[PDB]
């Protein structure tokens, strides 16, 4: 289409009007333009080519194959910065990727909380605020292979909220011990269980439990007695919220099997007073508690 100078003079710069006039006097209005399917001369988008883009066009004053300035008339005298910054926002960050501005600020508890929430539906806030994690066993194991000895880091950790909920987790990593602890912490939260506690301080009565080669003898204790038990049992009691306990481990004292045996004993070897009363159809009275009641 051929347009009158008035219209074309309201959209295009004066410097380009002469070129438009000459083109409208050399190309007949009835020109049937054909599309080339061998050579693509124009870009894949529409452009009047009246403005120089700061990025998609050559930089004015910069030397290059098609620079029209004389060699003594270039205007780039500083070379410490990139001449043509990226267009638009200034970045090419892929959709769904984040610029790594900050590194080393992650909390492994928050990483465990986010992953478990997505995988199991547990509340992240409870994991990151209510739970305490204590490593119990940290050793290196090795497998003999044809290539050679392959070492691995083994971590056994216990987590708990100090209010009845405790869990045991194990983790392995061939790379570093920190990765093994992360997996163990992850596993421990998934294994969280509630343990009955008498007066939220001790166990119900005494427990004689056999876990593989470990013989566990645990006795309930008076208020203010403290934890007088194997060190492995001490850590578990701390996380679980057991304050008063006495006990002795016989036969095997393997730390790993003491920890698992203890967790199992607290669940499979205890019976609440309420559960005993309902099963037998009898009333069970705590004499010490009644003595100080109204």
């Amino acid at each position: 289409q051929h347009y009158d100078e008035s219209l074309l003079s309201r959209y295009y710069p004066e410097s380009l009007l002469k070129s438009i006039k000459l083109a409208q006097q050399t190309i007949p209005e009835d020109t049937k333009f054909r599309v080339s399917r061998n050579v693509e001369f124009a870009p894949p988008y529409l452009d009047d080519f009246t403005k120089i883009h700061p990025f998609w066009d050559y930089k004015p004053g910069m030397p290059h194959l098609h620079a029209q300035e004389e060699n003594n008339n270039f205007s780039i005298f500083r070379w410490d910065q990139v001449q043509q910054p990226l267009p638009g926002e200034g970045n090419i960050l892929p959709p769904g990727v984040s610029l790594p501005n900050d590194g080393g600020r992650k909390s492994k508890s928050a990483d465990v909380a986010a992953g478990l929430h997505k995988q199991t539906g547990v509340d992240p806030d409870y994991i990151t605020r209510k739970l305490t994690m204590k490593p119990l066993v940290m050793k290196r194991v090795s497998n003999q292979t044809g290539k050679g000895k392959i070492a691995s880091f083994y971590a056994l950790v216990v987590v708990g909220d100090k209010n009845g909920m405790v869990g045991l987790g194990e983790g392995k990593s061939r790379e570093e011990m920190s990765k093994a602890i992360f997996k163990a912490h992850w596993d421990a939260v998934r294994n969280l269980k509630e343990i009955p506690r008498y007066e939220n301080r001790t166990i119900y009565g005494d427990i004689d439990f056999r876990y593989h080669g470990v013989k566990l003898h645990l006795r309930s204790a008076k208020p203010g007695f403290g934890l007088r038990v194997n060190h492995v049992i001490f850590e578990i009691c701390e996380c679980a919220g057991i304050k008063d306990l006495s006990g002795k481990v016989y036969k095997s004292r393997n730390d790993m099997n003491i920890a698992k045996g203890t967790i199992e004993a607290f669940t499979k070897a205890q019976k609440t007073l309420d559960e005993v009363a309902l099963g037998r159809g009898k009333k069970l009275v705590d004499v010490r508690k009644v003595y100080y009641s109204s």
């Binding site: 490593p135 940290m138 050793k139 290196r140 090795s142 000895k149 011990m177 920190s178």
Partner: peptide, 20 residues
Amino acid sequence: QKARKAMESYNELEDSLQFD
């Protein structure tokens, strides 16, 4: 001697990183 005792120092060192 190397394998068994090397980790005693590293696994305690892992605990050093925990406080860090």
